[PDB]
């Protein structure tokens, strides 16, 4: 019967909630009391990338820590060179409505998607020297909000149809579909080992997925509104979420709880992007206050601020080697902070 | 070095293509279209010429791009901000929906649902300045419907006859009263005319007005 299972279901939430309190031995704020602080983190705009004629919504570094991609509503996908600020490629898109980007780990491919419900994959290394579109993954029914390549053949995408999918680029069919989200999925982050990925949705929850099985291992709650960005801790045993509650939270996969919340009474706008430092000591979060904060990720003390954009900071990524942090914004400018 | 130089030359050639494309996109006119499922937005689109559908048409040497975003069926709170800076928001409402009710909801009128969507759009933080063209379609079917059915079914309070001229006018004024940004945006309401093909001309006139009165803003002559 409905009521049997429902009253049963709300009981299963109890053992989950019951055990989580029992494993809440001590607050991270108590454990990290004696770590000497990080000190003022002064970061200045080193490079400023100009050439976009609309708001930027997405950017992704390369594994080589030098090239990067950006997309905007102008319907152009540009591969930048961060060292020399010169454009390597400008990809015209068929659909001006792009909301995400990904640069393949090998650097051979780049993917973008948005309200057109399609994840288009563009081939960079091409005999005829003109980035050509390779495959169009059309199996979603809502706007794509994120996409992250695993290999040059596997790409995982998250959409507004409340589902994530893992694709096979050669065939163009969904190898697996991840369902379980009760709200619109906003962002996904792949683990360092590329075996797991967490997704954040508009239903104020984040779910840890297994890419192989296609089942959700754990689900984390604690936020009060939409989760707009998500990223793992470098060691893959933790991740952090940015929501419209203007709080960032650090969840643990082993302990299955929440560790920190990075709130300041001064901050009232919604987080648009989050990203970590190579050492995991800094949590950089791009807010809608038009600025971007840098949190001490083990003390929860806002040490540092990167205020340089006119409009909201849409995307924010750090390099693999951690030499730089680049932020995009709706003011049409990407700034490389070091 | 030499290769670096040729790289810069490449990057400049790239950019001069980004501007040339930027200046081609700026000439195009971006209309966002919204409304109910049966509004007649489908019928409006046909007169003018899954995911987000685009229609391109040219009228009197002006280029229009109409973004029928009716197929998204997701949370508008996350992707509506993508269209901030459209010239206009066309809004279609079917006048023949005053006595009905949606097949999905229990007893909320289709016309009352149209207002609820209009209230959230005209007062959306992303379209504080954006002008709204409001098309009211199916005016002839509304004439037949009103002649025999009362208007009290939708608006409980109404001082006025069951005459098309007055019946319609109550609705038009009722829709125009939704906006609290009376001093910022202009709602150009039109009654759909099938044969005249003036629905497209009214869009031309309403667009120029939003352009002319914007041009006078940035040069300070206003």
């Amino acid at each position, epitope marked *: 019967e409905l009521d049997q299972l429902r009253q049963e279901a709300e009981q299963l939430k109890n053992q989950i909630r019951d055990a989580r309190k029992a494993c809440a031995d001590a607050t991270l704020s108590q454990i990290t009391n004696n770590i000497d602080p990080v000190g003022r983190i002064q970061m200045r705009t080193r490079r400023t990338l100009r050439g976009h004629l609309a708001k930027i919504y997405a950017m992704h570094w390369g594994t080589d820590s030098r090239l990067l991609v950006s997309a905007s509503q102008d319907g152009k996908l540009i591969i930048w060179d961060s060292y020399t600020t*010169n454009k390597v490629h400008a990809i015209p898109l068929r659909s001006s409505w792009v909301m995400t980007c990904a640069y393949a780990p090998s650097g051979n491919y780049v993917a973008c998607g948005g309200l057109d419900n399609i994840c288009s994959i563009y081939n960079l290394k091409t005999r*005829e*020297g003109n980035v050509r579109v390779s495959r169009e993954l059309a199996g979603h029914t809502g706007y794509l909000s994120c996409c992250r390549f695993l290999d040059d053949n596997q790409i995982v995408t998250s959409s507004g149809d409340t589902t994530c999918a893992l694709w096979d680029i050669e065939t163009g069919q969904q190898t697996t579909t991840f369902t379980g989200h009760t709200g619109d999925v906003m962002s996904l982050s792949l683990a360092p080992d590329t075996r797991l990925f967490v997704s954040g949705a508009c239903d104020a929850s984040a779910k840890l997925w297994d890419v192989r099985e296609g089942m959700c291992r754990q689900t984390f709650t604690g936020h009060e509104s939409d989760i707009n960005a998500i990223c793992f801790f470098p060691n893959g045993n933790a991740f952090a979420t940015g929501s419209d509650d203007a709080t960032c939270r650090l969840f643990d996969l082993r302990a299955d709880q929440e560790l920190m919340t990075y709130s300041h009474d001064n901050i009232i706008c919604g987080i648009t992007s989050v990203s970590f430092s190579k050492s995991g000591r800094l949590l950089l979060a791009g807010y809608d206050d038009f600025n971007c904060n840098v949190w001490d990720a083990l003390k929860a003390d806002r040490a540092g601020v990167l205020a340089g954009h006119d409009n909201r900071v849409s995307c924010l990524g750090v390099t693999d080697d951690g030499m730089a942090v680049a932020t995009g914004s709706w003011d049409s400018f990407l700034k490389i902070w070091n | *070095s*030499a290769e670096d130089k040729a790289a810069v030359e490449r990057s400049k050639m790239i950019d001069r293509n980004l501007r040339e494309d930027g200046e081609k996109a700026a000439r195009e006119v971006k209309l966002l279209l919204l409304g109910a499922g049966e509004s007649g937005k489908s019928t409006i689109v046909k007169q003018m010429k899954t995911g987000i559908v685009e229609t391109h048409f040219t009228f009197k040497d002006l280029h229009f791009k109409m973004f029928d975003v009716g197929g998204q069926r997701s949370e508008r709170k996350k992707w509506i901000h993508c269209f901030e800076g459209v010239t206009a928001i066309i809004f279609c409402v079917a006048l023949s929906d005053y006595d009905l009710v949606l097949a999905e909801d229990e007893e909320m009128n289709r016309m009352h649902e149209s207002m609820k969507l209009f209230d959230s759009i005209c007062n959306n933080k992303w379209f504080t300045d954006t002008s709204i063209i409001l098309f009211l379609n199916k005016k002839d079917l509304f004439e037949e419907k009103i002649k025999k059915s009362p208007l009290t079914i939708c608006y409980p309070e109404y001082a006025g006859s069951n005459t098309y001229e007055e019946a319609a006018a109550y609705i038009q004024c009722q829709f125009e009263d939704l906006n609290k940004r009376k001093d910022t945006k202009e709602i150009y309401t039109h009654f759909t005319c099938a044969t005249d093909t003036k629905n497209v001309q009214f869009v031309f006139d309403a667009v120029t007005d939003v352009i002319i009165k914007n041009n006078l803003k940035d040069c300070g002559l206003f």
Partner: single-chain antibody
Amino acid sequence: VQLVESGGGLVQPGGSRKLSCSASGFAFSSFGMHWVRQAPEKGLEWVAYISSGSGTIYYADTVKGRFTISRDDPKNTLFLQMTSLRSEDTAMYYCVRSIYYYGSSPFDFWGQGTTLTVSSSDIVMTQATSSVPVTPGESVSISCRSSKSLLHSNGNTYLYWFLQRPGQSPQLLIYRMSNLASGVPDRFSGSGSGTAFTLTISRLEAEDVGVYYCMQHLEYPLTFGAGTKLEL
């Protein structure tokens, strides 16, 4: 992706002839083209270059102000206008394409070239090996020497390598030291620093017998090296 050139043949000295190279099957408009000539018995020698959209035209010392190089992007053709031909302009004129952007492989594709026979400050690259005998299945190293440190500040040692099999157009093997071209087996490798350069082949075959060349790209006018023929 073929490149074919038209013209050549026999001309009395002082005459003016035109060479046209019709690109087909790639984005010609976005490729920087060169021209490289090879004498009837001697090695390669750079002559001209045009950047993308005719933004930058360079020339060699021996042809400066004597040759005019032009492109027709709409028709995907490349032109060379030659004036007052001298006896030392007898060579096979290859047409090469190259694109310069971070991580690209310039001089990757070479045309078949045309034969032209007239009737009758520079980096200098030296490789002092010729007609080296080698047997298939053994390991061979080819050494090259420069007069100047090719290692630029940014870390790019603008030294290239090429292989010209008997009766074929030259083929890129290494586009910068410690880099490997497209379509070339893993056997070829190159390691060097500053002015000393080497090309190591682990195991070879009868397919890769022929003459090897070295080129620098640190600065124009892109002087090449002498040949290094593998003997078998």
